[PDB]
Amino acid sequence: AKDPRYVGNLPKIGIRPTIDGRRKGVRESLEETTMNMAKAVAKLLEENVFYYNGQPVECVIADTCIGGVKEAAEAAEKFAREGVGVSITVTPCWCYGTETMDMDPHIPKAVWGFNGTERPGAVYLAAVLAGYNQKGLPAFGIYGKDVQDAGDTNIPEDVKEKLIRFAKAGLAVAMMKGKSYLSIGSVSMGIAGSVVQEDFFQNYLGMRNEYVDMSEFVRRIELGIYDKEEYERALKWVKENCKVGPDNNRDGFKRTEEQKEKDWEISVKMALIARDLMVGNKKLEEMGYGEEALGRNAIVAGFQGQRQWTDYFPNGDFMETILNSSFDWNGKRAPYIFATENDNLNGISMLFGYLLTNTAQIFADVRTYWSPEAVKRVTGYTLEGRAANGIIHLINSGAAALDGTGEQTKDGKPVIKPYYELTDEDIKKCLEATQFRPASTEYFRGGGYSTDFLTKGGMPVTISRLNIVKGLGPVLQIAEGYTVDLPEEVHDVLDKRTDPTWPTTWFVPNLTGEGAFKDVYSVMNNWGANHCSISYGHIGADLITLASILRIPVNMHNVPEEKIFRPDAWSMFGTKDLEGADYRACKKL
Amino acid sequence: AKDPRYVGNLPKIGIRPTIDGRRKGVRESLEETTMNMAKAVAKLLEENVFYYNGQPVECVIADTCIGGVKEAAEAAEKFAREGVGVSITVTPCWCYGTETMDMDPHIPKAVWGFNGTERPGAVYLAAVLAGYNQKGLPAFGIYGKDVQDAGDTNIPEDVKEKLIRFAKAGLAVAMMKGKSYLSIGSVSMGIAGSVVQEDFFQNYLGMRNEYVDMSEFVRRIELGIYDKEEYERALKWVKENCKVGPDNNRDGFKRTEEQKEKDWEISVKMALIARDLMVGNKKLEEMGYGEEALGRNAIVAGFQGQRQWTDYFPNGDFMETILNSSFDWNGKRAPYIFATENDNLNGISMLFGYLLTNTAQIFADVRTYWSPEAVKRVTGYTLEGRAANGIIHLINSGAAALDGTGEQTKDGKPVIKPYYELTDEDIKKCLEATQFRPASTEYFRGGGYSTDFLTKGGMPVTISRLNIVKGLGPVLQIAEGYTVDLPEEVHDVLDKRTDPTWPTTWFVPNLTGEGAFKDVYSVMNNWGANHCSISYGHIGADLITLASILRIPVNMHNVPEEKIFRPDAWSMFGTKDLEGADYRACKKL
Amino acid sequence: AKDPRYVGNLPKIGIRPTIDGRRKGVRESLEETTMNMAKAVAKLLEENVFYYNGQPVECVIADTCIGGVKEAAEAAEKFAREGVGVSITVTPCWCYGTETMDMDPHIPKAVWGFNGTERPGAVYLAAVLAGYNQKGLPAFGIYGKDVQDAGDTNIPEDVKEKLIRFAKAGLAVAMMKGKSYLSIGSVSMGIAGSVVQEDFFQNYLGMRNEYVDMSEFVRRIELGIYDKEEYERALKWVKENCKVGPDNNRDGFKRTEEQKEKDWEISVKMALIARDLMVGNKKLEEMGYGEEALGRNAIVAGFQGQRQWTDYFPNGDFMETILNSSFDWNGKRAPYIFATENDNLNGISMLFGYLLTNTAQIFADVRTYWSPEAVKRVTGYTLEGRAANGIIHLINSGAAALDGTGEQTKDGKPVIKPYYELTDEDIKKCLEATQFRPASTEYFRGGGYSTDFLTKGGMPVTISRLNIVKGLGPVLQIAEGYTVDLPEEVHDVLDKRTDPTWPTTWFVPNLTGEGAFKDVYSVMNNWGANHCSISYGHIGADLITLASILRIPVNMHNVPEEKIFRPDAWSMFGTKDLEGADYRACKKL
Numbered sequence A, B, C: 001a002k003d004p005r006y007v008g009n010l011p012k013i014g015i016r017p018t019i020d021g022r023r024k025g026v027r028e029s030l031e032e033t034t035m036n037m038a039k040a041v042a043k044l045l046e047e048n049v050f051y052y053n054g055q056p057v058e059c060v061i062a063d064t065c066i067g068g069v070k071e072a073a074e075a076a077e078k079f080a081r082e083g084v085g086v087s088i089t090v091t092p093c094w095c096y097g098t099e100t101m102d103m104d105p106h107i108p109k110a111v112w113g114f115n116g117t118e119r120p121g122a123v124y125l126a127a128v129l130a131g132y133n134q135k136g137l138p139a140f141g142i143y144g145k146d147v148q149d150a151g152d153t154n155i156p157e158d159v160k161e162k163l164i165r166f167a168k169a170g171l172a173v174a175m176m177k178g179k180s181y182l183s184i185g186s187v188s189m190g191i192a193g194s195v196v197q198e199d200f201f202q203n204y205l206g207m208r209n210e211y212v213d214m215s216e217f218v219r220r221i222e223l224g225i226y227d228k229e230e231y232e233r234a235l236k237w238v239k240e241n242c243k244v245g246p247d248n249n250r251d252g253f254k255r256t257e258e259q260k261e262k263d264w265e266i267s268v269k270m271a272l273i274a275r276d277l278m279v280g281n282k283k284l285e286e287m288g289y290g291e292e293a294l295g296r297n298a299i300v301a302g303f304q305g306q307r308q309w310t311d312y313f314p315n316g317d318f319m320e321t322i323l324n325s326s327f328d329w330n331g332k333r334a335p336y337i338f339a340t341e342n343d344n345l346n347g348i349s350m351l352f353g354y355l356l357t358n359t360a361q362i363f364a365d366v367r368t369y370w371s372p373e374a375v376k377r378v379t380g381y382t383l384e385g386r387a388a389n390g391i392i393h394l395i396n397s398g399a400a401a402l403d404g405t406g407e408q409t410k411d412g413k414p415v416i417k418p419y420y421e422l423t424d425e426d427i428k429k430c431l432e433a434t435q436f437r438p439a440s441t442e443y444f445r446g447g448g449y450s451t452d453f454l455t456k457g458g459m460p461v462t463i464s465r466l467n468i469v470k471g472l473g474p475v476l477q478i479a480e481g482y483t484v485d486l487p488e489e490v491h492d493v494l495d496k497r498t499d500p501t502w503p504t505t506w507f508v509p510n511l512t513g514e515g516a517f518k519d520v521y522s523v524m525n526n527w528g529a530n531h532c533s534i535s536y537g538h539i540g541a542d543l544i545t546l547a548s549i550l551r552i553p554v555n556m557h558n559v560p561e562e563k564i565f566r567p568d569a570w571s572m573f574g575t576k577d578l579e580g581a582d583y584r585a586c587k588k589l
């Protein structure tokens, strides 16, 4: 399938049915069973793994079973030709190890050996993984716990989980390759993550780095380099759906009605320009701006904002809010992963979660750790339930996807769904639960409008953050948990003394009684940056798998050990201490 | 403050109050609060951190709050000329990360982010630490667990503990820089720790290595190159306060009455000469020995002794005993860290503990592990209380600071206090509890006097040892525990069959049920050398912090995990296995 | 001396007179001779080495001769508080190697051993250098070729040359530490050198990285955030001294008379703003812009320009031209090293040459290599003299210091002199030889004025370029040579078909018959980027010494081997192949 926004086609998953090369007996009796195994995996993935636009992932099966090097070479040729970015080998029998291996070092690979008794399927699995390990080609091994009868096309649950987790992580990794990260502006207020380390994007993600100074926005706004028809429709939509809340700026800091109107006009134009910069806009060609029409083929971008742009122009709050949302004046659509303060590392953190779930990701500051003692002292209230051990205030400096309201609903529960699953009611509720507030001029002299909402409680979420550490390189931290509801009177008190015009999410991480998850305080004290990315759901296991494919160690996470799924080679670096083994494996391989 | 013994001034602590650079509102409203925070830290440290001479540590505060690079540069400049060797950043608000960082890579640094809600102080803390981690500049993060109201000048208890631990460790590290380790003699009886590895002193401690052959003592003794007035006073003081115990040499091994007198004369001269070599003596200049009067600017030294010197001259027991003590014929004074058998690694082990406590350190041989079964077999006595699971006999080959008697008292409890806190009673009792015994001529053919005392039980102590391992470099081990008392009848039996003329300390390490602390035997079996250093108190946490600053991994320790305080970067190398992360951070950083 | 532009004081040079520690004879007979040597060096350096403002470098001499560690420590202490950034040891006798060494690893160091026979001065030189090499502390060795008699206070010519070269290189290195590189804008048109690699600035130069988006210029222009009194004076000065040349834009590409006036207004404001960002401006504080008044303490900066800014606003040609010049509306002054297209690597290339000469540096594109055959084919003219083997066209994209005209004169020869040596005639002629041309709107849509001049021939120059290569890091290339004159008829032809509105310098590199200097073509083909920095004079030897101090290998240079002056340790890595040894020493040390 053609990628609707980026150059080229969406990555495909290649299935390699390997078989015993011996004919006049063995192979003939296994041809149908082996190919059927491949077809079963394709059906499973097509019904459980989807591209960001909602289309089912597409699989490519080798033209023949692979019993030797000649057939392996033909599969490699076919896969390269059809744009395969992930590979899965399947077999119910013994096959000739290295003669049948996928030697492409540039694609995530897994092997599923049928747990059957008649043929050495598990023997091939272990044998070929030993080859992958010996050759330095990481590969995931999948082996079911319960013996299945020959030809059983029904894939067991434990196998299903591994196949899907691998496919999703592999697809996410394949999706980033060849795409750009667009830096709009430069470093923002000395934030480490706003410094672009090209080596990381190039070598770890296979991405390109594009740059554009914010002065570009001045030129396009002044010269009208954007779709004026869309602009008028957008401005109208904002007036009809974006509710303006109370101005918290006190006299001397309040902007005029005229200024506030212009703040909206420019904020909308900024959204259009940012999007045009990321994916281009064919409308610009008929307008005489052919170069601008191309776009930077960016699957993720960031906007510096402070301090240079915001000291004079409206801030990027609305732009950052709307782009990351799953809908706007043009209807429901896939989010545009856009980072506040040009924090590219948080941008990538958001991108990981997005490519694994197809859901909008929430940019946020890890603002405050509220202990039970502190809440009691300030509000007279005793935290209860999940919040009984303390809570963490997640609140970005003014921008957040409207999806963050938690108003989207499934089975009567708060969630964030892929845009293609949104109902008209989901969207209306997200908007109705949001208030746009005039920007605090003491911080943002140029004005603008911040996003004000309160995430509904009881929603499972995962916060994550990618950091780059000297002497180590990229490193990922994860914290699964839930959002929580505080009594209205309690929230109001904690909210007013912090930043009531910004978006609030009350988070409680799952505790393990070990590592950095002994208590809620430890989770925040161990976070490695001020920012984090929030995704709906518990995707820590998916993130761990994705990280291992990228060779990025996970310094901190609260995912149950039984759910850790990494390439077979990782076990060779240690089975008692998976953390240490992860570091050793990431460096050596 | 001028260093009373070494070249230059004592290290100062610089306080960096950072602030939001935005004026016309934000900054003006935070100037006082931020600067007051800096003043509060200076106050706390001056009341809790002291130089080795008892003088409170001195702090230097930046001339202005730091909201950008210009002010950061001014702070760096002031600190450099003020002689700052440790830096602490403080702030209750958001500041511009890299623009406000302390870029000096050669000084320990910490950052305290006020846990307030009005401004993003914890956000700056995390943001700038990400900067330090990304740039490879280790820095400690201090974040209080309970939200404080804007303007609160009080420093929470958890914050105080971290600030003080960091300050003490940082000061200890700064103290060693530029100082010398003086090697008197060469390797002693093939002891690995008596081999000097200059790379360690130079690269890890920033120290210089000085050398003097023991023949120097012969020259100074023969030519009277020492303060003769002090010598005569010292001799009288020794005869009056140092009581001679029974001679344990058998018939054909006792020295004549005339020899025993000369043994005392020489032992006292050795002490004078050793001290004169370490810190110089203006008296020598007046005598016509100007070069000798300068000294070697050594904050630590060692004396080979066996086998060459002791095969003919009185041993260094008295010299090693008195120099390490907190008093002598000239009254109470700071100890002179001096290593027996020129074991420079034990000397540094002692130096670490000394610089962190200002208390005399005990040099000791890890002589014997006595299991409950062994004690029972030999004495018929069943170990009780803390000693119930076994005890370890700590006893040096004849030398030990008199402070080791444990006669010094505080609140009715046995301790070792800084010399500036000693009472005449403390000193008097230390001397009364000690007997000086004629040296065993079969080992020390030249005679001498060993130190015989029994450390009082119930005193909290910490033993430690620094080792250098090929393929790793320096590595530190720590064991917190207590001294214990045994029935006199039991002590006599164990003592008599070991070395009754030497100093005894019965030690029991705290057990953890894991690692090398599953039982008392394991603590001994895992000790990496035959020597250790004993310090009063439980300073394992302090040693751990100091070790991390020096990038020296800790291979073994029994400090509660909640008390481990290392640079923020360490967590980036692992949160589940802190030991493995320690090795990774020390190596890569 | 206080640095007139940056925080703190200018770096000082410390002189360490070492001596034999033996008294009662040896030392007393050498006290005066040794201290006089130190005074002779201080005298020589003060008369030959100057700070960028023309002030003679200041030296600090140890308070006593250094015969042991105590005195060495005192010297280290005095130097640290005196602000010494370079050290030179001097002695006419034997001294105790490691006991007298300068152990500061963060400052360039040299040792001058008097070539006298009475005492082993050259023996100390070699002995202590062995110490520096063994300890990994690079140090330069200076040994005169002709024996001098005891007491000779004269410094031989060969010794003088080494002392001065070392002092100049050491001072340049010390100057950069603590200073900032200010990035105005981001990457320009995908130029690799415009990507900022903080690790290089931090670890190799000890510099800080500051960032400001170009939208800042929009704010300051619109809000009048600059000295308006100076602005008006500057405008008049420009109209009076900067003559406008013919407009080369064709019909539908010329800007209106009104636009051309505003182009000048903006170009002048840009220059003020850029300077204000680099070093601050107290005037801004009085105006109510206190944060802006501080500046970024930047000793070097760059302006992205294309494509974002120039696609709408007047280009930075005038700003880049005037800032790099040694004069402007405020009279003669030190240049402000400013990089076109935010090429920070060329900015540093310029900074190196500037700090070594105090002379304006020329930014240039290595535009064209003109072979004798090509010139002949296009003009019918046969290249003669130095240009006989081909010439290289050096011409930046519109900006170049007016010093580049070569109109400044000394002894009837064209040169570029420090601003403090300029005569009104020099300045006047530089301006007369320059024409400011309306910018080419097809490239610079916002207008602006380019600098058009022709560098006078016969001037010795050195071009250099710093590049960062993956798997190697920073690497420097140098090419000494001369500017040449071509018949006006010939120049016109080559100039017209290239870019006649830009500044031209015709360069001819010195050939060696080997390496990348076998012919003129090879010099160009081997250049590692499209840009280079031109400095007046042959400073390759000085750059080589500076590079070795910074541990930056020199991959290409045409400096005579007899003039290569690097730390003594370099020879330990090879004496036959100095290039290979350079790479080995830079990597291992």
Ligand SMILES: [Mn+2]
Binding pocket: A341, A364, A365, A396, A397, A531
């Ligand atoms: Mn933020």
Ligand SMILES: [Mn+2]
Binding pocket: A452, A453, A454, A500
């Ligand atoms: Mn709200």
Ligand SMILES: [Mn+2]
Binding pocket: B340, B341, B364, B365, B396, B397, B531
């Ligand atoms: Mn011993």
Ligand SMILES: [Mn+2]
Binding pocket: B452, B453, B454, B500
């Ligand atoms: Mn006893």
Ligand SMILES: [Mn+2]
Binding pocket: C340, C341, C364, C365, C396, C397, C531
């Ligand atoms: Mn150029």
Ligand SMILES: [Mn+2]
Binding pocket: C452, C453, C454, C500
């Ligand atoms: Mn011209």
